Amino acid sequence: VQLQESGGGLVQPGGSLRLSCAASGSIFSGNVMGWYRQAPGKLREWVAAITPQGVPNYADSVKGRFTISRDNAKNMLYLQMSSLKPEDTALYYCNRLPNYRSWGQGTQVTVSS
Amino acid sequence: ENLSKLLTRYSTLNTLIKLSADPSAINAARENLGASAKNLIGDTKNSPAYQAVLLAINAAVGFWNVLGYATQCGGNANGQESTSSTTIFNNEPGYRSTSITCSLNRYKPGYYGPMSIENFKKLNEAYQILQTALNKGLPALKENNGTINVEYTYTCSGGGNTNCDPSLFGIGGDGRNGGSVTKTQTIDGKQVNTTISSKVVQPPHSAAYTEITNALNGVPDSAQALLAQASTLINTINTACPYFSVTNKSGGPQMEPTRGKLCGFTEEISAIQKMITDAQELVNQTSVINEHEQSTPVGGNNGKPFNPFTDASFAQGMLANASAQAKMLNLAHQVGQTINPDNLTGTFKNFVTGFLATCNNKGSPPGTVTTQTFASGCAYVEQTITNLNNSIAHFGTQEQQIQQAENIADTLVNFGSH
Ligand SMILES: CC(=O)N[C@H]1[C@H](O[C@H]2[C@@H](O)[C@@H](CO)O[C@@H](O[C@H]3[C@H](O)[C@@H](O)[C@@H](O)O[C@@H]3CO)[C@@H]2O)O[C@H](CO)[C@@H](O[C@@H]2O[C@@H](C)[C@@H](O)[C@@H](O)[C@@H]2O)[C@@H]1O[C@@H]1O[C@H](CO)[C@H](O)[C@H](O)[C@H]1O[C@@H]1O[C@@H](C)[C@@H](O)[C@@H](O)[C@@H]1O
Numbered sequence: 001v002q003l004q005e006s007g008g009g010l011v012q013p014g015g016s017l018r019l020s021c022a023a024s025g026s027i028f029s030g031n032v033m034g035w036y037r038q039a040p041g042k043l044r045e046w047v048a049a050i051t052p053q054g055v056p057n058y059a060d061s062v063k064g065r066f067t068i069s070r071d072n073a074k075n076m077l078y079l080q081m082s083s084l085k086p087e088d089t090a091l092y093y094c095n096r097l098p099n100y101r102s103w104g105q106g107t108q109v110t111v112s113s
Numbered sequence: 114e115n116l117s118k119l120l121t122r123y124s125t126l127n128t129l130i131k132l133s134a135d136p137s138a139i140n141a142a143r144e145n146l147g148a149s150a151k152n153l154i155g156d157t158k159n160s161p162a163y164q165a166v167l168l169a170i171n172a173a174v175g176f177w178n179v180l181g182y183a184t185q186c187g188g189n190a191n192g193q194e195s196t197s198s199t200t201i202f203n204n205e206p207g208y209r210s211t212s213i214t215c216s217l218n219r220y221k222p223g224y225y226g227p228m229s230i231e232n233f234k235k236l237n238e239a240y241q242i243l244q245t246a247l248n249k250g251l252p253a254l255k256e257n258n259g260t261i262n263v264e265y266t267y268t269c270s271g272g273g274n275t276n277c278d279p280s281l282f283g284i285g286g287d288g289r290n291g292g293s294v295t296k297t298q299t300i301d302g303k304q305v306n307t308t309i310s311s312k313v314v315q316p317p318h319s320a321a322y323t324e325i326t327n328a329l330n331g332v333p334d335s336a337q338a339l340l341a342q343a344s345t346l347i348n349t350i351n352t353a354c355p356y357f358s359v360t361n362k363s364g365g366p367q368m369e370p371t372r373g374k375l376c377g378f379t380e381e382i383s384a385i386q387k388m389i390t391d392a393q394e395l396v397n398q399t400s401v402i403n404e405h406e407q408s409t410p411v412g413g414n415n416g417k418p419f420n421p422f423t424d425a426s427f428a429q430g431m432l433a434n435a436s437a438q439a440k441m442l443n444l445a446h447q448v449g450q451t452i453n454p455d456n457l458t459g460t461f462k463n464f465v466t467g468f469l470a471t472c473n474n475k476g477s478p479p480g481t482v483t484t485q486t487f488a489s490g491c492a493y494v495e496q497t498i499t500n501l502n503n504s505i506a507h508f509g510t511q512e513q514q515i516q517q518a519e520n521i522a523d524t525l526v527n528f529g530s531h
Contacts, residue, residue: 029455029456030450030453030455030456031446031450032502032505032506034506034509036513038125040124041128042128043125043128043129043132043513043517044125044513045513046509046510046512046513048509049506049507049509050506051499051502051503051506052455052502053499053502055503055506057506057507057509059509059510097446097505097506097508097509097512098439098442098443098446098505098508098512099512099516
């Protein structure tokens with residue numbers, strides 16, 4: 001019943017980043033998990049998801065740049081981001097799907113030169 | 114204090130208000146609701162709702178395939194002890210058999226005894242209807258005037274065996290050889306035509322038997338109606354609570370205990386009852402969504418700018434539609450979580466991974482009974498969990514859109530009050 005993201009920071013366009021999410025077992029075990037983001041001026045947006053058996057799917061805006069993965073032994077969700085753009089600047093959040101209704105603090109990602 | 118300071122701390126709220134004032138953002142969210150409703154109640158493979166309904170039904174059918182063969186049953190039509198009655202039900206998952214034989218004589222049907230024939234008939238009818246349905250494919254949740262034909266047979270032999278007497282079915286006193294009756298029968302408030310026929314067979318070198326044929330023409334295949342059948346299946350089992358004696362294969366996962374009473378499987382049965390209950394609650398959201406459809410576009414009137422405080426009488430409906438879609442989505446996930454073996458322990462886990470989510474036929478189509486169906490689920494429980502999951506993952510954007518729509522509408526209903 002807890003979620004906690006890290007690994008964000010300021011990068012250069014073209015740059016790349018690896019985000020992590022530590023989730024409690026009650027949230028994570030046996031559940032589809034996913035990443036989200038909230039860009040300035042916009043509402044939270046779904047970005048990616050992955051089934052317990054590790055099958056991933058992505059929003060069209062990130063397909064082919066980002067890769068979501070999960071480690072089922074440590075209740076950890078990862079997002080690996082390449083070819084970052086300024087459009088990808090946002091607060092990034094992790095949750096199960098469907099969503100547990102209290103979000104974590106998120107991790108800020110900013111992209112700029 | 115005031116709003117500026119409040120929006121300095123909560124900017125997604127500021128963005129929510131901006132949207133709530135803009136008819137084209139509202140109309141976009143209303144379109145999204147139209148599309149996600151279609152994903153939930155019009156689609157099959159992609160609908161988490163469809164998959165959850167399907168899992169709930171499959172888990173009940175599979176429970177019976179696992180233990181049906183080991184379940185004692187017997188006696189006569191009055192529910193009492195028989196001297197020599199053998200009553201066999203076809204297309205059921207028996208020990209090395211595509212029938213189940215109910216021939217436990219002398220012992221008295223009842224709790225922690227043989228299931229009575231009356232109770233087995235109820236259980237059997239339900240199992241045949243579900244299996245025929247699963248074979249043909251469940252329809253989408255919105256489609257609920259579909260029908261199917263179901264046909265099943267059973268036999269009675271032995272002196273004293275009253276379980277195929279013509280008077281049970283309304284057939285002439287005799288009757289029993291060639292007689293037939295066609296009659297309505299109510300199933301989930303719908304009118305089904307039912308034909309019941311009897312013949313006597315005298316095979317050349319062994320005992321005479323009576324064969325009863327039931328033809329149900331127009332059984333409803335809607336989600337609501339099929340979940341009532343799955344409920345009838347699992348409750349008939351739980352309430353008759355008969356004696357069972359299992360046969361383990363040496364090696365591979367094993368069933369404990371080897372004997373007892375079926376209602377003794379309390380977690381397995383409670384989980385399946387919960388799943389059905391949750392699926393039924395979820396299917397009941399269908400009507401709420403249809404009633405509150407969002408296809409009409411909104412704006413100011415008389416070409417006047419849109420006023421979020423006066424022009425938003427549609428918001429209550431928009432909010433009820435979105436809340437209902439989100440309730441569907443969450444009950445669907447809940448169904449899956451009740452049975453998913455990643456979060457189970459002890460004897461319940463080993464029941465699901467070891468038996469329910471396996472199949473010993475041969476992947477043969479859904480609803481198939483073979484001489485090897487017994488002591489396995491053969492209801493695609495693993496694939497159904499996997500597909501429920503995949504659908505939920507592919508519902509990521511829609512789930513967000515539904516939450517944004519619920520929030521836009523809540524905001525307008527608030528403005529609207531006062
Ligand atoms: C008790 C019974 O089943 N009676 C049948 C009778 O059965 C005989 C017969 O089939 C003989 C011939 O081989 O074999 C007997 O089985 C032997 C077996 O052969 C052996 O291997 C050995 O191991 O043991 C057993 C038995 O000890 C059977 O028991 O078959 C006749 C002939 O066709 C049935 O008679 C007719 O059908 C009925 C409906 C009437 O229309 C008659 O007039 C027909 O000739 C006879 O059935 C019983 O008939 C009486 C008539 O007094 C009642 O009508 C009673 O209800 C009938 O039993 C009912 O219906 C039968 C078909 C069966 O389903 C019963 O379970 C049911 O109660």
